[PDB]
Every structure is written in C-alpha cells, then in structure tokens.
C-alpha cells in the first residue's frame with residue numbers, strides 16, 4: 001500500500017485534535033487502579049490505546065466505551081490489577097502499555113506474560129526490570145535480558161531502588177505510577193541523566209489528578225509513600241495530542257496561511273507544546289490561547305538545538321528543515337534509535353531520497369536541504385511518525401509517496417484526511 005500526496009499550494013484552517021496518546025494510556029491505567037468510576041472525555045482511538053484497553057479488559061477491568069471510542073467510563077478496581085489466569089497479553093508496539101503494565105502487574109501474585117510485535121521485542125526494558133526486581137518483583141525475561149517478552153509473577157514490595165534515566169523516561173513513569181500501591185514506601189534514585197523529563201511531568205500531573213503526590217527531588221530522587229489508593233476525579237478531560245499537533249503547526253509554518261489547533265494551549269501538561277517555540281525560532285509567527293495554538297507562515301531559517309525535551313515533535317523539525325535556509329542540527333536525541341524504529345537511521349535514509357545531505361550522528365542529526373526537492377517513495381518502518389513527518393514534503397512543488405500509510409494509526413488513524421481538510425492543492 002502507498003499514498004501519493006499531490007503538491008499543496010496552501011494550508012490554512014482549524015484542526016480539532018484527537019486525544020493525546022500519552023495522557024490517554026496513563027489515564028486509563030490510573031482509572032483502572034483507582035477507587036470510583038472515572039469518565040474520560042476525548043480519549044484517543046488509536047492502536048496504542050486499543051492495546052491498553054484490550055489488556056485492561058483481559059485483566060478484568062470493567063469499562064464502557066462510546067460508539068466513537070472517545071468517551072470511556074472506567075469502574076476502578078480500587079487496587080492492583082488481578083487475574084487468576086495465566087494470560088499472555090499482546091501489546092503491539094505500545095511503550096505506554098508495555099512499560100506501565102510491566103510495573104503494575106508486579107503488584108500482587110499474578111502470572112502474566114507481556115509481549116508484542118517483533119519490534120517491541122527489540123525495544124529495551126531492562127532498566128525497568130532491574131528496578132522492579134530490586135523492589136522484590138519476580139520477572140523472567142523469556143528470550144533475552146533487557147527486552148520483552150516478560151513473565152511477571154508479582155511480589156513488588158517497594159524499598160530503595162535505582163532506575164537508569166538515560167534510555168527512556170517510560171521506565172521511571174511506570175515505577176512512579178505503580179509505587180503508591182506497593183506495601184512499602186519506595187525511594188527511587190535516578191542513575192545518570194534523565195531523558196524526556198517532560199513526560200515525567202505528565203505522569204506526575206496525572207497522578208496528582210488521581211489523588212497521589214510524590215516528592216520529586218530535582219528529578220534525581222523520588223520519594224513515594226506506599227499503601228495508597230488512587231481516587232477517581234470523576235470527569236477527566238484528555239488533552240488533544242500535542243505531538244499530533246506538530247504536523248499541522250509545521251504545515252502552517254511552511255505553507256500557510258494560518259493553521260490553528262484546538263484542544264491544547266498555553267497551560268497544557270504535554271511537553272510537546274514547546275514545539276511551537278521552535279517554529280517561532282525558525283521564523284514563523286505563533287499565537288497562543290488557553291485552548292489553541294496557531295502558526296502562520298514566515299520565512300524559515302534553520303536552527304541548532306538540543307531536542308531532548310521534545311524527542312517526538314523534533315522529528316517534525318527534521319522534515320520542516322527541508323524548507324528552511326541553512327543547516328538544521330537536532331542534538332541529544334540518542335533514544336530515537338530505540339523507538340518504533342531506529343529513527344536516526346530511518347530519518348537520515350529517507351531525507352536523503354528527497355535530496356537532503358544528512359550527517360547521522362550517534363545522538364544527533366544534521367540536515368542540509370537541497371536547492372530543489374526530489375520525488376521519492378518514503379519507507380515508513382512501521383513508524384507512524386515517519387509517515388506524518390514525510391507528508392510535509394508535499395508542501396512544495398514535488399509530490400511525495402508514503403509507503404504503508406496506515407501505520408499512522410498507532411496514534412492518528414485519520415491523519416491524512418485531517419491534513420487534506422486544511423490543504424489546497426496546487
């Protein structure tokens with residue numbers, strides 16, 4: 001399968017964002033653990049969320065979904081997830097299911113195997129397993145240490161644990177969400193640098209919404225009290241997805257017009273709202289509201305920036321760089337290599353097909369645009385963001401052909417239709 005995008009002369013309009021994947025999967029897990037019934041509004045319907053929903057169903061969590069799957073009423077367990085069956089749960093390539101559920105299922109005495117698609121068995125989890133085992137969990141890495149599939153037999157108590165922060169923030173997120181329900185207090189010491197810190201902030205905001213606070217000591221040590229129970233907030237509104245928003249804001253920066261996205265704004269908890277600051281630095285004009293961000297085209301110039309705070313939205317800058325004057329350098333993005341694909345390799349390989357000169361560093365990428373873009377078929381590596389980032393090539397005089405376009409469904413099934421709604425073809 002492929003989709004050819006014809007050259008787009010102008011983008012403009014207003015995009016009502018689908019729900020945030022990061023918020024959706026945290027809120028589903030917390031609602032399943034909490035006391036009380038939580039009603040989630042603007043939940044994302046995408047593969048990653050569906051895998052979380054299916055796992056929760058298999059684990060006995062009671063919930064109802066609206067016809068469109070964006071409103072979900074979750075009856076909380078008022079305690080850890082529990083199954084008497086020796087289940088095997090398939091989690092696709094959803095890190096926000098695999099990492100958080102691996103930790104959550106270490107509470108109690110279940111016997112559950114977590115697995116996923118071939119790529120998920122190549123994505124690291126050892127830093128999380130190490131910390132969980134330090135706290136008493138029984139875990140078997142059935143194929144190789146440091147990777148799924150995992151057999152979880154429970155027993156996490158708490159105590160003094162160390163988690164490496166240098167590869168994924170999702171390990172710390174998973175520990176943070178599970179620790180409050182453990183029988184003992186947990187003191188988490190961070191080994192090394194912590195990457196993707198804004199996603200830790202999402203986790204802490206969500207936990208607070210569900211009635212639990214922790215002591216965050218400068219992102220280097222976290223004190224969590226055990227013996228707690230999450231408390232349903234009642235209604236909870238899932239923010240629009242700020243990572244999905246990046247494509248439309250960038251499209252406005254490149255080929256607007258003014259493109260406005262709704263469902264996020266200046267006070268959102270998602271770190272990817274800071275992507276708009278990059279577009280502003282490149283020369284676009286950005287306007288903020290409480291519930292929108294808008295971007296209007298201006299002449300674009302390259303940037304050289306540390307992108308560790310926005311690793312996903314940073315991919316959008318890599319293709320937006322094709323439209324900027326000068327060489328763009330994106331630094332401190334090593335963990336691109338361990339995500340849906342090796343995104344440093346993939347981004348460099350596909351950018352070169354459209355004519356860019358690319359230096360693929362170990363943990364950075366440097367992109368020098370060609371004078372004129374070239375037509376290419378873009379491989380997408382079963383990575384939603386490769387498809388969505390390369391859609392921006394068509395904001396030029398050159399079409400682009402996206403291979404396997406349905407991979408966008410990991411987080412954004414209707415991406416191309418939403419892009420078409422704001423596009424005027426040349």
Ligand SMILES: O=C(O)C1=C[C@@H](OP(=O)(O)O)[C@@H](O)[C@H](O)C1
Pocket residue numbers: 021022023095096167168169170173195196199311312335
């Ligand atoms: O916690 C989250 O919701 C996420 C954390 C990030 O991963 P890393 O912490 O591995 O960078 C991000 O890339 C991912 O898409 C979503």
